[PDB]
Write a protein that binds this ligand. Structure first.
Ligand SMILES: CCCCCCCC/C=C\CCCCCCCC(=O)OC[C@H](O)CO
Ligand SMILES: CCCCCCCC/C=C\CCCCCCCC(=O)OC[C@H](O)CO
Ligand SMILES: CCCCCCCC/C=C\CCCCCCCC(=O)OC[C@H](O)CO
Ligand SMILES: *C\C=C(C)/C=C/C=C(C)/C=C/C1=C(C)CCCC1(C)C
Ligand SMILES: CCCCCCCC/C=C\CCCCCCCC(=O)O
Ligand SMILES: CCCCCCCC/C=C\CCCCCCCC(=O)O
Ligand SMILES: CCCCCCCC/C=C\CCCCCCCC(=O)O
Ligand SMILES: CCCCCCCC/C=C\CCCCCCCC(=O)O
Ligand SMILES: [Cl-]
Length: 265
């Protein structure tokens, strides 16, 4: 599976290699450092929304372990020989990223429907169609990327199929947001709109990284892609989580929860 990603095609200078290694290790520290934040502040969240901050904790660890795994797999696969890091063992690949998205994405969406105050049959209903839409996006995306070295034409076709799911998914998100924000408290009806525009931006970086092999097939594209994933990672999971948390705390205070009213105070 590693021989199917362009990373196995190029030698990397010490700067390109150590720069990629530093992006992955940094992502580990950022996520686990955020994990502590999401853990501590959970007490200041009412029981209604407390599950939202717990989902962020699960997202931080899920992303941290894979990023840490990517880093080690990045140092075990290459060795500095004759002035450049050259492949050695087939272990590094971007497929592990996609397997992670299968888990983190359902968590990122579910904590969005919690702060929106959805409940009952609608919560279980809107959650199933979104996840099935998300999984369809990730699976078809995992198939196309297997061809990013052999058949770029297939990468396009699968990227197109994956985009159909992505558009439908966002449409359901945007539809529920703008039809349920009036219920939110403490003025969070305004914050939830920015979160959606924060989603449309950070999430769109992934299909761009997915297309790096097409318009930049070289060692600098491997670097740009990992840089794009990093920027998108800390925006779809960290910054995104911080906003979800802020919303969960604000509505908690507006609902009469003392630990939340004393925290903001
Ligand atoms: C043969 C090739 C496969 C072709 C067929 C698979 C690909 C379908 C792709 C996009 C449409 C998916 C959307 C289908 C679901 C529409 C209903 C819906 O999503 O609404 C849920 C509701 O809004 C929740 O509250
Ligand atoms: C292969 C390429 C195919 C790409 C095709 C491009 C079409 C993109 C159009 C819209 C994006 C939809 C994003 C969802 C925006 C939410 C807006 C919404 O839901 O409507 C507001 C609501 O009705 C008020 O209550
Ligand atoms: C460093 C944290 C910067 C991000 C701060 C995000 C604010 C979230 C919040 O509601 O504040 C929690 C407060 O720190 C609990 O005492
Ligand atoms: C870590 C968090 C998230 C939300 C990862 C999300 C990934 C995507 C939104 C990926 C989308 C893709 C599409 C729309 C089509 C090309 C292939 C991708 C899977 C990269
Ligand atoms: C506070 C948060 C503490 C976070 C502690 C972890 C910090 C960095 C990640 C360490 C994982 C090992 C990275 C080195 C492996 C490598 O060189 O690829
Ligand atoms: C199959 C995919 C559908 C998954 C269904 C997700 C259902 C909810 C899991 C998280 C529990 C959230 C309940 C919060 C408490 C409450 O409802 O008041
Ligand atoms: C538990 C993971 C499966 C989730 C199924 C729900 C998602 C539905 C979306 C499309 C799934 C398509 C599965 C078949 C694709 C075959 C491609 C392949 O793996 O070779
Ligand atoms: C979950 C309900 C069933 C829908 C499952 C979705 C199946 C995948 C969607 C369409 C795939 C079309 C692209 C296939 C390209 C194959 C090219 C080739 O093999 O030569
Ligand atoms: Cl990722």
């Amino acid at each position: 599976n590693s021989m199917k990603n362009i990373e196995s095609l190029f030698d990397y200078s010490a700067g390109q290699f150590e720069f990629i290694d530093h992006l992955l290790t940094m992502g580990v520290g950022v996520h686990f450092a955020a994990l502590i934040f999401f853990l501590v502040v959970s007490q200041f969240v009412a029981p209604k929304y407390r599950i939202a901050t717990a989902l962020s904790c699960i997202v931080m660890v899920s992303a941290g372990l894979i990023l840490n795994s990517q880093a080690v797999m990045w140092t075990d696969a290459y060795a500095y020989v004759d002035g450049s890091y050259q492949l050695q063992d087939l272990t590094f690949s971007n497929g592990y990223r996609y397997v992670n998205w299968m888990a983190t994405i359902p968590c990122l969406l579910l904590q969005l429907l919690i702060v929106l105050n959805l409940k009952g049959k609608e919560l279980f209903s809107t959650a199933t169609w979104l996840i099935l839409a998300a999984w369809g996006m990730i699976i078809t995306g995992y198939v196309g990327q297997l061809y990013e070295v052999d058949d770029i034409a297939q990468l396009m076709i699968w990227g197109a199929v994956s985009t159909a799911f992505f558009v439908v998914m966002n449409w359901i998100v945007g539809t529920k947001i703008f039809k349920n924000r009036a219920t939110m408290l403490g003025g969070t009806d305004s914050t939830i709109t920015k979160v959606f525009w924060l989603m449309m931006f950070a999430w769109t970086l992934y299909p761009i990284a997915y297309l790096v092999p097409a318009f930049m097939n070289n060692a600098d594209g491997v670097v740009l892609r990992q840089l794009l994933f990093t920027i998108a990672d800390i925006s779809s999971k960290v910054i995104y989580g911080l906003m979800i948390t802020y919303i969960a705390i604000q509505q908690s205070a507006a609902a009469g929860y003392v630990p939340a009213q004393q925290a903001l105070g």
